[PDB]
Write a protein that binds this ligand. Sequence first.
Ligand code: F43
Ligand SMILES: C[C@@H](OP(=O)(O)O)[C@H](NC(=O)CCCCCCS)C(=O)O
Ligand SMILES: O=S(=O)(O)CCS
Lengths: 550, 101, 259, 442, 442
Amino acid sequence: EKRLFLKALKEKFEEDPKEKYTKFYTFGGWEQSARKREFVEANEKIVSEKRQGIPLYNPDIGVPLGQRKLMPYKLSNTDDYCEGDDLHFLNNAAIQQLWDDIRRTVIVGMDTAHSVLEKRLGVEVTPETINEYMHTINHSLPGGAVVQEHMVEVHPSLAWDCYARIFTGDDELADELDSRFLIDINKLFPEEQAETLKAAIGKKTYQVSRVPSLVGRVCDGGTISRWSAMQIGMSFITAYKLCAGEAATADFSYASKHADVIQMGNALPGRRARGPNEPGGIRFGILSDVVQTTRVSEDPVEQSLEVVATGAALYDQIWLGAYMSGGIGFTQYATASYTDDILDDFSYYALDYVEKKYGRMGTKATMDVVEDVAGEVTLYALEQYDDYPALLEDHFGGSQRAAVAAAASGIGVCMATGNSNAGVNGWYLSQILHKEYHSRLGFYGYDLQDQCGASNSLAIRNDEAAPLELRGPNYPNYAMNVGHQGEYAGIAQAAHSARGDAFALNPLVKVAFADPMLVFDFSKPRKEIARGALREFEAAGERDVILPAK
Amino acid sequence: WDDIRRTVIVGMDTAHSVLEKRLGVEVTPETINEYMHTINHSLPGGAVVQEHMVEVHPSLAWDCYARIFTGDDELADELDSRFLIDINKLFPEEQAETLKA
Amino acid sequence: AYTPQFYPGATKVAENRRNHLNPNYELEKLREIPDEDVVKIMGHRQPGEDYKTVHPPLEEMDFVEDYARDLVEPLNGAKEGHRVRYIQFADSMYFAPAQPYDRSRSYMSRLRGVDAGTLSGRQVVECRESDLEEFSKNILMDTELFDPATSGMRGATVHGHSLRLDENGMMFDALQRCVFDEKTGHVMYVKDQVGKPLDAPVDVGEPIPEAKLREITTIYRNDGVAMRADPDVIEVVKRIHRARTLGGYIPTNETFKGL
Amino acid sequence: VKYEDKISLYDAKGNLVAENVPLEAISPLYNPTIKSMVKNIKRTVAVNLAGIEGTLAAGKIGGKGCQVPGRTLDISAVSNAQAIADEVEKILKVSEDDDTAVKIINGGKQLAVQVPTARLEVAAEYSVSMLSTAMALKEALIKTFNIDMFDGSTVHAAIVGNYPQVMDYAGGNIASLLGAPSMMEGLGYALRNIPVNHAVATTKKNMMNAIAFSSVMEQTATFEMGDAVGSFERQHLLGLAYQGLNADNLVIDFIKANAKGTVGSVVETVIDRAIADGVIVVDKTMSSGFNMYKPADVNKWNAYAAAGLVAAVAVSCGAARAAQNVASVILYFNDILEYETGLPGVDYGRSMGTAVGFSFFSHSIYGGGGPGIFNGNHVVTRHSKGFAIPPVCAAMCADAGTQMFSPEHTSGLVGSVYSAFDEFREPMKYVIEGALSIKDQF
Amino acid sequence: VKYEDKISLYDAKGNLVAENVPLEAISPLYNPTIKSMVKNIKRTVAVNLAGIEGTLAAGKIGGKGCQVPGRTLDISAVSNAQAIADEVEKILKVSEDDDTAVKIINGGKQLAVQVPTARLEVAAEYSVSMLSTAMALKEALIKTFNIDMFDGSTVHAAIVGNYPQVMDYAGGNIASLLGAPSMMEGLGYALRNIPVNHAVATTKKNMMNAIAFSSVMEQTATFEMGDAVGSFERQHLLGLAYQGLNADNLVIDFIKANAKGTVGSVVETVIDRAIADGVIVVDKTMSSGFNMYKPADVNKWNAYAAAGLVAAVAVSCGAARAAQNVASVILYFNDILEYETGLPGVDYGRSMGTAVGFSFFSHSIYGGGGPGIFNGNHVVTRHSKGFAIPPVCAAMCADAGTQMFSPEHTSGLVGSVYSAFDEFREPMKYVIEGALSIKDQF
Ligand code: F43
Ligand SMILES: C[C@@H](OP(=O)(O)O)[C@H](NC(=O)CCCCCCS)C(=O)O
Ligand SMILES: O=S(=O)(O)CCS
């Protein structure tokens, strides 16, 4: 038989993938991996120079590592391999920039501001004036002070990643504006997607403020909205020469920086207390709109799986990995959704089975379609683990198999029906069928939301009901446990990828993250994590110009 | 701001009581020194259990330290000075006595 | 009265699961390990010292008069105030006779006053120390629930439940608490479940053969028997899922007409 | 009794109603009218059926700029309306003699539901009203139009909006006068959530009634905060009586005396009235003249200064016919009074600090919004304990339509819902009547 | 009226009280005892006078390991507790017959105050009790011992820890059964913020009384959250009646039938009783011979499973006499019930998942802790709407002292203060009496 995950198993395992036996305890320990050896030399040098004898890294104490073969990791749809330590979010600059670009993004609309300028302030708003304002905000957003040399300013090379962009559904305003700082919908999207997004947005103008990454490094996520609002107000009162001491300026300030602000994430309450633009506040549909695979691909499985990879690397690796727990983290809890083509093979089988039986989107979402599609995909995914011992050895944790199989089942249900809640219902059925198949499920966590979910997937109660696009890490069932949130966003994307939709939840987020000026390009999230694993990703937020070289 | 943000003080006295009366494990300064040696490896992100685990680069965690200080002079005597914050050495005598009290 | 049926399914694996769930089913005896050997393998205490105490005995301490609490008899370790200890097993996915959810369910349906917890790589039981030693030696070690090759008692660093067996048919163990001697064919324990080495190796016995392991396992496998050969368990699972969904939506009798 | 203070009650036209009324007759702990307004605010829910229909038709669930393709439901909530209201009333009904009241507003496009007090008697917080109304509305919509089981989440998102993810009602079509109790500035700040524009629209742009509404809510909130407990209760009762309810006709008298005047003339009339009534006396005369003044009654002097503050705001904003002057009038009223008498201002400088807050909030690019959205549950405006907000109601009532944050733009639904109740449309008259009903028990 | 199913009533000893009691007689919207419990839980404040004296004597204001040298006050509050209580009662009194009670507990070491109901009628929430008690205590301490004006800040810090900076009461010596509204994880979760240790210490470690207290609080909360309205109300009413009040003596009979049994024996007892009562019937017989069951009454089967869940928890944790078994018992009762019958769990698997997360956060490094610190407001135990917390309360009642964070360690002031009231200590014998009082009104 031919399987998509077979090639990675041939490369990662010396033995035959179907062979049931191997040997251990003859790999030399941690010396089998070049990353561990590099860590050891770096630790000795760092201790002796900086730490003045205080021990930092001691591989001798603790578990004797390397008793089994430390396998390398492929990255799905990419022809490159890396060690598992390179996929850790602290060791991978691409994952850090993935979160940095999302954190530093604020979308503000300029239509109430223009209306207040035209009517209440008596100032004409022309495309030339909009170009002047865009020049002013592009100078002023990173650290700049317009025509005030006495003012203290941030070093420009320290904020090279900062940009202020504009986009609009109004076409004649778009061609009348400067292309230097314009996100052109027509040339960045296909014709049907551009028409759909222009219809959804309307005839309104929006500005995208990319606050510099270092601001998010030093401060928190709620800093970004205040930074963008302050600089937008300053650039508006500078480019348009307005008095900054009257009540009309207060009304214009509301219209310009408090009327149509679109934030990436909401604030979180209680014991998970956090500000806006933190990854616990990002809904699954918003993250689906962040990833831009519908722009460059027509395959619904690939469109869902790029969102799966981005959601894994954000929610499981960064948010739950450090923000909620900390430590070594949950890196290969999440990489198993995007290392090999295991999830790719399972999702392509789900798509093939749905296309053979129910067509592309030929059935209304009922119970029976959910049951039979999720059961078939779960049985196939589990027997694939059964007849490939190398596949079982790769996904050694039962959580890093439950999620994969349930994500494939939910993706298949979302193909068949187009409803995201039906897809999450298929996910929950797949989880309990996995539990009865292997007499096993994840970690010891791991199915608070998977035995509960069944009842809360189609609930209508206040704290139990939400569409899956409106759900996120602050959803009460999904608040704590790893291995679900990233795959939920792919299921939410799979509902709209089956319909061929241009966006999932927010058209403005979809257009904003199509910007070529972003350092992390969200068109191929798997490929750039590979680039950050091979140390060829140029990240932002480095204070190299304010630090000594010795 | 980074040094203030990354600082967390945890009292290791209820944990010793849990070790002593719930698990029946005696706590000696030798075991405390072993714990300090362990946590100075684990706090930057080293692996102590769970074979086939990745670790962070120690070059990115050179500023990560786990330190211990005690108001007990007898415990602070046979404690490893590598991990110990010495109140008597870092403070004037009256200030040291006030802090220990 | 009501006669229990424990699990659905007509396949051999479902029959083994029903046998494990049934408290009136006598588990097949395969080994004979003395109590001192099991105590020294758990590593909680040496054989010879008294049981240490987490709280005074129930006779010495005084309580309020609670009618509902005092008509349930306690364990012998509970009235002696013994500490709560653990025994933790890792079960291979290649036809181990006991499986984590199966074990948990069997231990909760058979033993009194135990805390059972399941994971992918480990299953742990918490109970009072004397009772824990008693049921561990009587049931968990010398029955069909244990195989020295495919099941190892590991208190920490559990890894190997989903890995391939070695050339001796034994599970992977990073700490190597379990060794196989070829000149006798038995399996020896050189460390306790935590990983501390013992004074002398303790023999647990010969590994169960693979042909016997196929007919006593409680896991579904494509190379063994699969869930596709047991549609009744899948139907029960789908019914449970549909009942959960309908109860979550609207908990009325009219909603459950579409069951 | 414990307070010997007597007040004379006047109506909004300056005519005498009753004399020698005890000060505790207008207390929130005694007045039945204030209790009724608190209970009605706690149990009244406003439902936008037209907003629900528009959200479901276009699939506009979520928040600002959010739209889910494929999750569109074509129901007719405005056309049915009465059936939905009957179903919601039947679900929310506890007893047959219940206070459950689901009335139809603007011909079916809005609902004004009042949940029974039985559900609030066993609730620790007021949020039972909105959650119960949301659940009843979801059930009524699912049963009235046969919504599929897989679209109940869409119905919930249209009604409430992002609640399990965002602990608030952001993109929904259900509203209340009180925000989430976890979104308060401080503990006990729930009653200071009604903005100025809501109070103005509820009272149909009446000056004295909006002042009375704002003062009643603010001082009842100070009672809720524990601030008006012990030695502060007399000062808060006097502040409520003289600032919001026009005790001894002080506000009307100062406005009549300063019809052509300025803020300084209002300060002069306030000092003259306080000297004539014996509230303040001469402390000592300095070498350069300037006889210092000290209060013979500290709380009464604070109440007189608060009434004069309201009158000064009314005089200046009736001269300008613009509501942008509130911050400067409060700030420099307090400043001129302090450096004219050597006496403390309203709330001992807290009113001046809140006026500085109003200044930087409504007069700069650092500012945001106008004075119509001022409420005590904001970090800018929380500092004065019910002495700086009721003048803003007079200022917005005197506004001749030169504010972007007009009451018509921001509080039309609130006015249409809460103007039907008599104690909300005319709080002054009914609070005076409730004080008259309990005169003899003191 | 709208529910025609009747229940019997049994006490904690298993003796019959009355028969044919309507289901709505124990409803939170009808039962006078539940209404009185909710009203009294909102006005009762626990005061640590000895804690205040120790904090002031050593300058321990601030919180965990915080000392301010120089702000040390030497007062004798425990000796002058009678005068302090008299002054607090004088300050907090509204009329002269108001239900204001300041009782002295443990010889002046603790103080149990009850602020009047009229102070809470005009309050939107429950925070008025603690703030009013703090202000009354501050005034009483300032005027009893002649404390300087520059040390009233220290007195405030001793009474309430860091309230203007931290929106909570952490370093102070005042407490209540309910948590702060800022700690709520959802709207309507105010009654869910009672930890298990507080309920166990309130009922003096009586198993059935703690089950009744936790069940009454949790189901009244589900009424407050709007969850138990409409078609959802009958399920929560039956869950409160059977799991929490042992309506048909199901809990006591199951525990008696499994005195020397396991969780599985309780499961078969529950299935046998449900079959004998006609609650469940055989749906179909499969080819393997498995008898798939269907509920003839869905909500009654839910209530029977919940009562059996409480019985299984009591049996296993009375056998072990250790409270660390709740999560496993709640998990595997449902886990083997579902695959024995083909029927859904206690809360359609919302409670088994609660146990799967309880098993995470009671046996791992990632958070949680002992079973006693969890509550309905906790992120781990909020998912089951009143069906998982009374088992935890029963298990903590059955604990013999194997927990480090015991109710004695955690709830010493709260338990001693709230055990002085008969309604909080023994909720069974008074909720049954309240049901008997309104038995004839349906
Ligand atoms: C000590 C714990 C208790 C706990 O709270 N976390 C542990 C350990 C912890 C540590 C590992 C510390 C180290 O490197 O030594 C961390 C990294 C959490 C942290 N931030 O400190 C972690 N686990 Ni765990 N943990 C994992 C996993 C697992 C799987 C292992 C499967 C199996 O082979 O048995 C099992 C759960 C199970 O019950 O099945 C597991 C258990 C356990 N995990 C058990 C017992 C471990 C034991 O072997 O003795 N982890 C995995 O399934 C893979 C992902 C992996 C996480 C790190 C990563 O993503 O690289 C890691 C995540
Ligand atoms: C339970 C709760 O912990 P506390 O009981 O509040 O200490 C909560 N845990 C979490 O959500 C941990 C999330 C990530 C750790 C486990 C990942 S599977 C938290 O951190 O606030
Ligand atoms: O073993 S646990 O499920 O507790 C944590 C695994 S990361």
